[PDB]
Design a protein around this ligand. Structure first.
Ligand SMILES: Nc1ncnc2c1ncn2[C@@H]1O[C@H](COP(=O)(O)OP(=O)(O)O)[C@@H](O)[C@H]1O
Lengths: 66, 41
C-alpha cells in the first residue's frame, strides 16, 4: 500500500489483504474477501467516540454504595 | 500593652472551614476552560 499510493499512474492495486491460511499477500477482492463498507465505517466512527470520552477522564470519584 | 484578651479561641474553626472547603474548589480547578478535563463519577 505504501507503494501503491505512489501513483494513487501505473496499475494501482490496493485491495491487497492478508491470506493467513497460506501466509502471503493477495488481492482480497479477487480472492473473495468482502466486507460491507457500512461496517468499517461505523466500526471506526464509533470506537473513537469512546476513546475520546475516556481521553477526557482525569479524575474518577467513586461514591460509596449501600 | 495590657487590654482585652479573648479567652475564647475557635479561631481555628474558621481556618479549618476555609481549608476543608477550599479543598473542594481544588478538585474542580482542573475542569475550567477549553483545556478543562471531565470527571467520571
Ligand atoms: N477560546 C477560549 N480561550 C480562552 N478561554 C476560553 C475560551 N473559550 C471559553 N474559555 C473559558 O473557559 C472558561 C471555563 O469554562 P468551563 O470549563 O466550561 O466552566 P464554566 O464554563 O462552567 O465556567 C470560561 O470562563 C471561559 O473564560
Amino acid at each position: 500500500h505504501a507503494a501503491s499510493q505512489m501513483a494513487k499512474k501505473r496499475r494501482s492495486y490496493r485491495n491487497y489483504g492478508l491470506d493467513l491460511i497460506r501466509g502471503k499477500i493477495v488481492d482480497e477482492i479477487h480472492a473473495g474477501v468482502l466486507e460491507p463498507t457500512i461496517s468499517k465505517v461505523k466500526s471506526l466512527k464509533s470506537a473513537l467516540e469512546a476513546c475520546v470520552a475516556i481521553l477526557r477522564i482525569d479524575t474518577m470519584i467513586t461514591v460509596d454504595p449501600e | 500593652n495590657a487590654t482585652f484578651k479573648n479567652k475564647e479561641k475557635p479561631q481555628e474553626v474558621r481556618k479549618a472551614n476555609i481549608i476543608a472547603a477550599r479543598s473542594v474548589a481544588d478538585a474542580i480547578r482542573t475542569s475550567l476552560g477549553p483545556k478543562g478535563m471531565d470527571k467520571m463519577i
